Design an enzyme around this catalytic site. Structure first.
Site, PDB file in Angstrom:
ATOM      1  N   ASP A 199       0.847  -1.208   0.000  1.00  0.00           N
ATOM      2  CA  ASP A 199       0.000   0.000   0.000  1.00  0.00           C
ATOM      3  C   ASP A 199       0.875   1.249   0.000  1.00  0.00           C
ATOM      4  O   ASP A 199       0.700   2.154   0.809  1.00  0.00           O
ATOM      5  CB  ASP A 199      -0.942  -0.034   1.214  1.00  0.00           C
ATOM      6  CG  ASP A 199      -2.135   0.932   1.122  1.00  0.00           C
ATOM      7  OD1 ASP A 199      -2.449   1.450   0.030  1.00  0.00           O
ATOM      8  OD2 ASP A 199      -2.734   1.148   2.200  1.00  0.00           O
TER       9      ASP A 199
HETATM   10  C1  LIG Z   1      -1.586  11.644  -4.139  1.00  0.00           C
HETATM   11  C2  LIG Z   1      -2.533  11.761  -2.913  1.00  0.00           C
HETATM   12  C3  LIG Z   1      -3.789  11.003  -3.073  1.00  0.00           C
HETATM   13  O1  LIG Z   1      -3.326   9.666  -3.053  1.00  0.00           O
HETATM   14  C4  LIG Z   1      -3.618   8.662  -4.068  1.00  0.00           C
HETATM   15  O2  LIG Z   1      -4.091   9.057  -5.119  1.00  0.00           O
HETATM   16  C5  LIG Z   1      -2.966   7.339  -3.908  1.00  0.00           C
HETATM   17  C6  LIG Z   1      -1.901   7.170  -4.946  1.00  0.00           C
HETATM   18  C7  LIG Z   1      -4.002   6.296  -3.728  1.00  0.00           C
HETATM   19  O3  LIG Z   1      -3.453   5.049  -4.113  1.00  0.00           O
HETATM   20  C8  LIG Z   1      -3.642   4.559  -5.430  1.00  0.00           C
HETATM   21  C9  LIG Z   1      -2.544   3.675  -5.792  1.00  0.00           C
HETATM   22  C10 LIG Z   1      -2.655   2.284  -5.103  1.00  0.00           C
HETATM   23  C11 LIG Z   1      -1.657   1.425  -5.598  1.00  0.00           C
HETATM   24  O4  LIG Z   1      -2.445   2.277  -3.814  1.00  0.00           O
HETATM   25  C12 LIG Z   1      -1.248   2.787  -3.088  1.00  0.00           C
HETATM   26  C13 LIG Z   1      -3.901   1.724  -5.396  1.00  0.00           C
HETATM   27  O5  LIG Z   1      -4.064   0.516  -4.787  1.00  0.00           O
HETATM   28  C14 LIG Z   1      -4.899   2.673  -4.958  1.00  0.00           C
HETATM   29  C15 LIG Z   1      -6.323   2.207  -5.204  1.00  0.00           C
HETATM   30  O6  LIG Z   1      -4.861   3.947  -5.538  1.00  0.00           O
HETATM   31  C16 LIG Z   1      -4.604   6.224  -2.388  1.00  0.00           C
HETATM   32  C17 LIG Z   1      -3.551   5.744  -1.448  1.00  0.00           C
HETATM   33  C18 LIG Z   1      -5.841   5.539  -2.316  1.00  0.00           C
HETATM   34  O7  LIG Z   1      -6.002   4.839  -1.155  1.00  0.00           O
HETATM   35  C19 LIG Z   1      -5.939   3.351  -1.123  1.00  0.00           C
HETATM   36  O8  LIG Z   1      -7.117   2.867  -1.647  1.00  0.00           O
HETATM   37  C20 LIG Z   1      -7.143   1.509  -1.504  1.00  0.00           C
HETATM   38  C21 LIG Z   1      -8.440   1.161  -2.142  1.00  0.00           C
HETATM   39  C22 LIG Z   1      -7.005   0.999  -0.155  1.00  0.00           C
HETATM   40  C23 LIG Z   1      -5.711   1.449   0.336  1.00  0.00           C
HETATM   41  N1  LIG Z   1      -5.474   0.979   1.636  1.00  0.00           N
HETATM   42  C24 LIG Z   1      -6.270   1.503   2.757  1.00  0.00           C
HETATM   43  C25 LIG Z   1      -5.412  -0.528   1.673  1.00  0.00           C
HETATM   44  C26 LIG Z   1      -5.673   2.868   0.243  1.00  0.00           C
HETATM   45  O9  LIG Z   1      -4.408   3.320   0.685  1.00  0.00           O
HETATM   46  C27 LIG Z   1      -7.020   6.518  -2.424  1.00  0.00           C
HETATM   47  C28 LIG Z   1      -8.142   5.751  -2.878  1.00  0.00           C
HETATM   48  O10 LIG Z   1      -6.831   7.357  -3.401  1.00  0.00           O
HETATM   49  C29 LIG Z   1      -7.263   7.275  -1.183  1.00  0.00           C
HETATM   50  C30 LIG Z   1      -8.398   8.283  -1.202  1.00  0.00           C
HETATM   51  C31 LIG Z   1      -8.730   8.503   0.107  1.00  0.00           C
HETATM   52  C32 LIG Z   1      -8.135   9.507  -1.873  1.00  0.00           C
HETATM   53  O11 LIG Z   1      -8.939   9.802  -2.777  1.00  0.00           O
HETATM   54  C33 LIG Z   1      -7.042  10.380  -1.531  1.00  0.00           C
HETATM   55  C34 LIG Z   1      -7.663  11.656  -1.119  1.00  0.00           C
HETATM   56  C35 LIG Z   1      -6.070  10.505  -2.516  1.00  0.00           C
HETATM   57  O12 LIG Z   1      -6.576  11.130  -3.667  1.00  0.00           O
HETATM   58  C36 LIG Z   1      -4.771  11.199  -2.146  1.00  0.00           C
HETATM   59  C37 LIG Z   1      -4.378  10.983  -0.816  1.00  0.00           C
HETATM   60  O13 LIG Z   1      -5.005  12.508  -2.055  1.00  0.00           O
END
Ligand SMILES: CC[C@H]1OC(=O)[C@H](C)[C@@H](O[C@H]2C[C@@](C)(OC)[C@@H](O)[C@H](C)O2)[C@H](C)[C@@H](O[C@@H]2O[C@H](C)C[C@H](N(C)C)[C@H]2O)[C@](C)(O)C[C@@H](C)C(=O)[C@H](C)[C@@H](O)[C@]1(C)O
Ligand SMILES: Nc1nc2c(ncn2[C@@H]2O[C@H](CO)[C@@H](O)[C@H]2O)c(=O)[nH]1
Length: 300
Positions: A199
């Site tokens: 993650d």
């Molecule tokens: C830039 C900053 C943004 O980060 C991301 O874009 C990264 C790059 C995502 O990972 C990306 C990339 C990746 C690989 O994860 C690292 C992928 O799996 C996910 C779906 O999207 C994150 C972290 C995702 O979370 C993950 O979602 C998963 C469903 C579960 C996971 N965890 C609790 C188990 C969790 O961390 C998720 C959905 O975007 C979180 C929600 C809350 C957001 O919309 C938030 C506000 C984000 O836009 C952000 C923080 O601003």
């Protein structure tokens, strides 16, 4: 009297049952679906993170994660949470005070700040930190009872996740075809697995004041699996240019690569729609489900 979100009396009692005496400022994040996260001051003058499982099914995950972190501690040249308390009702660790590599206000959909694209120190140290993580021996992961996926099992998991989404949701035909083509594209897939964080993105990386990677947090998804899992978020945040720099330095630092790695990382990033949809489905949260359905039905 002033109404406050934290229940200080209940938190004090909980911590005290596990040998921690809370005293001084605290802060509470209740937005997590599985844990309440409190940063609290303890009588050692130090801040500690209280990671409070909400339900029995979450509590069940504490013991295996504790074994992972215990194994990783000496084997990484950066900090990870030191779970001095780890049980079904409470995980607690001294706070790693270095900032995350992105800052966001709880509940907000927009970060205040993300470590800049042009931070060479961050880029470089993230690449070497990642190479170090992926160099942790498989034998150590096995000895720590980690979830292990061979390359075949790694690809099967992706297939299973795609198929679960196909059963529960209605997906854009082109999206479906992309994932199927990827699953059928032998050259994309690695011929080995590594210890992955699972993650990993800027919000789970800690940096010192100079923007050098100093730690990683939130290890609940750690396992032995496809290395590209830990590179997808770097591509999202830092683009193809950032990915190119990562791969050059990762390889120079000893990280194992393969010729279609960059391609595979992009397909892994696209597969994030599957990950999100299954998270939404398992969460039962209608707002997350609404977002997932909208994404899946939409053309990429
Ligand atoms: C830039 C900053 C943004 O980060 C991301 O874009 C990264 C790059 C995502 O990972 C990306 C990339 C990746 C690989 O994860 C690292 C992928 O799996 C996910 C779906 O999207 C994150 C972290 C995702 O979370 C993950 O979602 C998963 C469903 C579960 C996971 N965890 C609790 C188990 C969790 O961390 C998720 C959905 O975007 C979180 C929600 C809350 C957001 O919309 C938030 C506000 C984000 O836009 C952000 C923080 O601003
Ligand atoms: N800087 C820092 N943030 C943490 C730590 N533990 C938890 N967090 C924050 O709390 C969230 C939930 O664990 C993380 O994603 C971080 O935002 C830590 O040791 N150091």
């Amino acid at each position: 009297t002033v109404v406050t979100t934290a229940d200080t009396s209940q938190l004090y009692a909980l911590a005290a049952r596990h040998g921690l005496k809370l005293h001084g400022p605290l802060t509470v994040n209740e937005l997590g679906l599985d844990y309440r996260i409190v940063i609290a001051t303890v009588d050692d003058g130090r801040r500690w993170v209280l990671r409070i499982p909400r339900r029995a099914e979450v509590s069940a995950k504490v013991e295996p994660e504790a074994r992972v972190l215990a194994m990783l501690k000496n084997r990484l040249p950066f900090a990870v949470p030191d779970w001095r308390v780890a049980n079904a009702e409470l995980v607690a660790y001294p706070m790693l005070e270095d900032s995350t590599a992105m800052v966001i206000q709880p509940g907000s959909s927009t970060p205040d700040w993300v470590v800049p694209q042009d931070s060479e120190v961050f880029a470089e140290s993230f690449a070497t930190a990642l190479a170090a993580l992926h160099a942790v021996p498989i034998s150590a992961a096995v000895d720590a009872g980690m979830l292990i996926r061979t390359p075949t099992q790694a690809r099967q998991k992706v297939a299973d996740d795609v198929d679960r989404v196909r059963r529960e949701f209605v997906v854009n035909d082109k999206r479906l075809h992309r994932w199927q083509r990827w699953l059928d594209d032998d050259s994309s897939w690695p011929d080995f697995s590594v210890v992955v964080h699972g993650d990993l993105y800027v919000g789970h990386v800690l940096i010192d004041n100079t923007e050098r990677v100093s730690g990683m947090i939130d290890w609940s998804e750690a396992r032995v699996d496809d290395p590209a899992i830990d590179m997808a978020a770097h591509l999202m945040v830092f683009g193809e240019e950032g990915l190119a720099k990562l791969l050059l330095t990762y390889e120079a630092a000893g990280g194992r690569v393969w010729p279609r790695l960059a391609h595979h990382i992009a397909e892994r990033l696209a597969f994030g729609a599957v990950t999100y949809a299954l998270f939404a489905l398992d969460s039962g949260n209608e707002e997350y489900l609404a977002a997932a359905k909208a994404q899946l039905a939409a053309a990429e």
